[PDB]
């Protein structure tokens, strides 16, 4: 029925800020209780602010003041505009509707660290081997790595190949960077046989690349 | 005073049982919260209502058992396929608090990892580092090792793992740990070994590779 | 009420003729207005002062005649060099209504195109696109019909044409058609065609390639 | 005699801003009736606001409030300030000094899309071939696709060579961003004898890049 998309978030330093819009793909967003919920990675839950059908506002506990709600509802948009972020939110941000308990909430980011790299990927083929090949299959997989801006995806075949592909959590060095490798398993008849090309695509920039994986030479 | 909701996490199970998990409320409340489900890098979607009364769209496999405090849910005859965390809240009052999360695990019995190792790729070791990646598929016990040997000789704090969610189909896990040098560094050794450790395997697994050689 | 002025647009001509614009107004105006050239893809240039009283810095070819309302513009003795529209303003009032202007084109004869098919360049195909480019060069009937065919299949819905202004010495025009596949579709197929119709042709011509085949 | 020149044009989102500097390349902006004029592309002229020798503003009919005109005389500039641009003027700017009718005005340009691409080129170098040989000559060319910021220039020779080089009108992609190739004719004779480089300039974005066009392997 109702299918909630959000958009606007990205990375900003403190004292920034930033509009984020609960896009109603659904209905009627005029006469809903509506409400922002935040989560820090690896953290519960938490609650932001909320509106009521008839205009109320109601903020959290830090972060009251500074941190602003309102809606539109004939474009059906909540409006979010956020000011002065204490850089500690950098957090994973919900919009819900509200219907007596709640459900029906989409999913969006955001991040607020105090630097900006911003800068994509360094992609690398791991190529099936030997090493990697026991018996009917055989892995190889893509290395995507030194990258600021953490929402980065990798799929295998502009999404064809569903079957073992597995991309493994970022891991963030000690250079400040994230880094993540995405492999996937084939049968060992097959090593270059069909197509194997990693898409690449860094959202927060605009990095598209597209990487064949061949066996070593 | 605000109410401090508590839940014993960390559960492990196997499938088609019964498991039970409460929720504790630190002050007196009534009977009107909710559990959710967070399946890992999702939305939450709610399954028990303001009580008990279990929201719709949702299996029969959900007993919310509620009261004045100390609620509880249940979920009997379990199936692969509720990997996340599950949290309590308090609708009703504006600022509401939320729970602590329980993850739980689902057993499986003893399945070794498929082991591999890449070497860097030239590309990589033009600009001038090298990222020794191995690879461990499909596996029940994470508790796995992975051991760096270059030259024979164990390395330690080079290297970075990460671990998948566990499989919503085979119950398995999957591993990969990357090990990073220099260029300079990288030219100055030959063997590069990966050691795997596992329940499964009854000695350890070796995969390695010779520094240049097709 | 403000004027609406109107113009009956689309003019056709050849050298050395004449040709008259008139411009309408919806509204009982005196006699103070202007005309004005605008090539495209440039600024205006006013011809007509506030009446006829033709602004200096321009040939003898204009005449512009004015009334009470009513007013019209006449070239006499073209020249290929005019490419651009007109239009009608209305000065001394503030807020002033602008016209709809006219485009005028040039009669030629007969000039079939010369044609041209490039294949995608090695670099794009890198990418993971393949543009392929068809030229048609100078030519007067503008209604030329480019069909694209890959392997003998006529290709529909994965190009863009465009076209150039009528030429100011030859008065021709060029045109473009960019057919645009993957990579991956492009190396599915051989024979690149690209078949042009045009009146100058007394049967169509067809340019083409051999994906892969210096 | 008179040149008036204009500096300021870009892209920006609704709620923004930009100020236009009509520079009076030229004299005595002190004392002459100044306007700014308007056109849509594809559609016919429209007027925006006026100054006059001794200040007064009469703005627009739809950009009534929301704008602001102003000169400056010893500078010899004309300023336009706006804010809070409906995106629905997307439009080609023109200043013009009214001497009792118009003339002398020169052109600038803007855009007010509701994202921000800003890329730059893609560019390929199209082979003279003899599939575009004929006779006594042969074409070649340059394609420069996938930007946004619609005002690019590609030259050949940078300059050199204005015979046969006719650029044609950019093409708008369903993936929303701009394309468009520019072909020279050369004598046969001279398919790779001499000097074809075509010079590809991103204004709004810092591109610059020359690309050579020699026959196909």
């Known amino acids: 029925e109702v299918q909630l998309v959000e958009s606007g978030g990205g990375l900003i330093q403190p004292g920034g800020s930033l509009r984020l819009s609960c896009?109603?793909?659904?209905?009627?967003?005029?006469?809903?209780?509506?409400?922002?919920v935040r989560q820090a990675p690896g953290k519960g839950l938490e609650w932001?602010?909320?509106?009521?059908?008839?205009?109320?506002?109601?903020?959290?506990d830090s972060v009251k003041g500074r941190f602003t709600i309102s809606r539109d509802n004939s474009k059906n948009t909540l409006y979010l505009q956020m000011n002065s972020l204490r850089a500690e939110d950098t957090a994973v941000?919900?919009?819900?509707?509200?219907?007596?308990?709640?459900?029906?909430?989409?999913?969006g980011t955001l991040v607020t660290v105090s630097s900006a790299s911003t800068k994509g990927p360094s992609v690398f083929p791991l190529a099936p081997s030997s090493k990697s090949t026991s018996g009917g299959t055989a892995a190889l997989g893509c290395l995507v790595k030194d990258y600021f801006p953490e929402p980065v995806t990798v799929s295998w075949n502009s999404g064809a190949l569903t079957s073992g592909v597995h991309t493994f959590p970022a891991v963030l060095q000690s250079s400040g960077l994230y880094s993540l490798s995405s492999v996937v398993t084939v049968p060992s008849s097959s090593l270059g046989t069909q197509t194997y090309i990693c898409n690449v695509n860094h959202k927060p920039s605009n990095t598209k690349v597209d990487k064949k994986v061949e066996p070593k030479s | 005073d605000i109410q401090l909701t508590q839940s014993p996490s960390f559960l492990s199970a196997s499938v088609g049982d019964r498991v039970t998990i409460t929720c504790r409320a630190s002050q007196g409340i009534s009977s009107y919260l909710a559990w959710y489900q967070q399946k890992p890098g999702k939305a939450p979607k709610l399954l028990i209502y303001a009580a008990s009364t279990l929201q719709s769209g949702v299996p029969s496999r959900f007993s919310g058992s509620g009261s004045g405090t100390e609620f509880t849910l249940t979920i009997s005859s379990l199936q692969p396929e509720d990997f996340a965390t599950?949290?309590?809240?308090?609708?009703?009052?504006?600022?509401?608090?939320?729970?602590?999360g329980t993850k739980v695990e689902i057993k499986r019995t003893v399945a070794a990892p498929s082991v591999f190792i890449f070497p860097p790729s030239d590309e990589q070791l033009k600009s001038g580092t090298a990222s020794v990646v191995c690879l461990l598929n499909n596996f029940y016990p994470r508790e796995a090792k992975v051991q760096w040997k270059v030259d024979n000789a164990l390395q330690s704090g080079n290297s970075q793992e990460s671990v998948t969610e566990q499989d919503s189909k085979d119950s398995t896990y999957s591993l990969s740990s990357t090990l990073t040098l220099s260029k300079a560094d990288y030219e100055k050794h030959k063997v590069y070994a990966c050691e795997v450790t596992h329940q499964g395997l009854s000695s350890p697994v070796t995969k390695s590779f010779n520094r240049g050689e097709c | 009420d403000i004027q609406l002025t109107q113009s009956p647009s689309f003019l056709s001509a050849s050298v050395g003729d004449r040709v008259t614009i008139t411009c309408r107004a919806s509204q009982g105006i005196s006699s103070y207005l202007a005309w004005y050239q605008q090539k495209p893809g440039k600024a205006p240039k006013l011809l007509i002062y506030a009446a006829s009283t033709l602004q200096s810095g321009v040939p003898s070819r204009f005449s512009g005649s004015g009334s009470g309302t009513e007013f019209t513009l006449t070239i006499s003795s073209l020249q290929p060099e005019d490419f651009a529209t007109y239009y009608c303003?209305?000065?001394?009032?503030?807020?002033?209504?602008f016209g709809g202007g006219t485009k005028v084109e040039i009669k030629r004869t007969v000039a079939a195109p010369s044609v041209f098919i490039f294949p995608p360049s090695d670099e794009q195909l890198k990418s993971g696109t393949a543009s392929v480019v068809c030229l048609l060069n100078n030519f007067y009937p503008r209604e030329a019909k480019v069909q694209w065919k890959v392997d003998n299949a006529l290709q529909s819905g994965n190009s863009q044409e465009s076209v150039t202004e009528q030429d100011s010495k030859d008065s021709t025009y060029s045109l473009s058609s960019t057919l645009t596949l993957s990579k991956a579709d492009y190396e599915k197929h051989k024979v690149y065609a690209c078949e042009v119709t045009h009146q100058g042709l007394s049967s169509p011509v067809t340019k083409s390639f051999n994906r892969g085949e210096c | 005699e008179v040149q008036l020149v204009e500096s300021g044009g870009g892209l920006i989102q609704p709620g923004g801003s930009l100020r236009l500097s009509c520079a009076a390349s030229?004299?005595?902006?002190?004392?002459?009736?100044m306007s700014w004029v308007r056109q849509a592309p594809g559609k016919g002229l429209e007027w925006v606001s006026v100054?006059?020798?001794?200040?007064?503003?009469f703005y627009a009919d739809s950009v009534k409030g929301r704008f602001t005109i102003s000169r400056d005389n010893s500078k010899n500039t004309l300023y336009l300030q706006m804010n809070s641009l409906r995106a629905e003027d997307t439009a080609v700017y023109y200043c013009?000094?009214?001497?009792?009718?118009?003339?002398?005005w020169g052109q600038g340009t803007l855009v007010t899309v509701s994202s921000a691409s800003t890329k730059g080129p893609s560019v390929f170098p199209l082979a003279p071939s003899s599939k575009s040989t004929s006779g006594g000559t042969a074409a070649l060319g340059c394609l420069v696709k996938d930007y946004f910021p619609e005002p690019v220039t590609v030259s050949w020779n940078s300059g050199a060579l204005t015979s046969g080089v006719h650029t044609f009108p950019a093409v708008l992609q369903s993936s929303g961003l701009y394309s468009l190739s520019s072909v020279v004719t050369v004598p046969s004779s001279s398919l790779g004898t001499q000097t074809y480089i075509c010079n590809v300039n991103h204004k709004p974005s810092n591109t610059k890049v020359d690309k050579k066009v020699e026959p196909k392997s």
């Open positions: 100054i006059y020798p001794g200040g007064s503003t």
């Open positions: 303003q209305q000065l001394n009032s503030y807020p002033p209504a």
């Open positions: 030229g004299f005595t902006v002190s004392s002459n009736y």
């Open positions: 013009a000094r009214e001497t009792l009718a118009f003339d002398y």
